[PDB]
Write a sequence for this structure.
């Protein structure tokens, strides 16, 4: 249901951006994904997935544990924010 | 602290998009704002504010009360999702 979000493309960009220790990778990679793949990648359901994923990471856990956990359990529904 | 998010102009776009009864207004206005102001409007703190506001709206609370409530109470910190 989240094919329009290009969530794997965003993840690749974020990992490469962070590996270069750049600033504001979440913001910059959102901009590139928008410019490459268009406005549908900014839907609220895409935003829910990205927020669950990046919150998990920002709060200490590992990027990989956060990605798999979000990808397996989060469909982009607004209620997902209460367990992800 | 959230001046870089251009949240006022985002709401302007969102309200006009809704008055025209268009689809995917969240996506359309996120895209237009970044196409005007660049990657800074896609920072995670902007995303925290917007998610607090739009979740409140998606769950049936009036749009104006969600925006005003979020603007007085949300600074964009990751913990803000726990009460907004």
């Amino acid at each position: 249901n989240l094919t329009h979000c290009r969530l794997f493309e965003f993840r690749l960009c974020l990992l490469e951006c962070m590996s270069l220790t750049l600033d504001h990778c979440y913001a910059r990679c959102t901009t590139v994904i928008t410019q490459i793949h268009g406005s549908d990648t900014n839907r609220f359901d895409c935003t829910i997935f990205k927020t669950c994923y990046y919150r998990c990471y920002v709060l200490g856990k590992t990027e990989d544990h956060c990605w798999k956990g979000t990808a397996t359990s989060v469909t982009g529904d607004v209620g997902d924010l209460e367990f992800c």
In short: The CA atoms of residues 14 and 27 of chain B lie 9 Å apart. Residues 3-82 of chain B form one domain. Chain B has four helices and no strands. Helices of chain B lie at 7-19, 25-37, 44-58, 63-73.
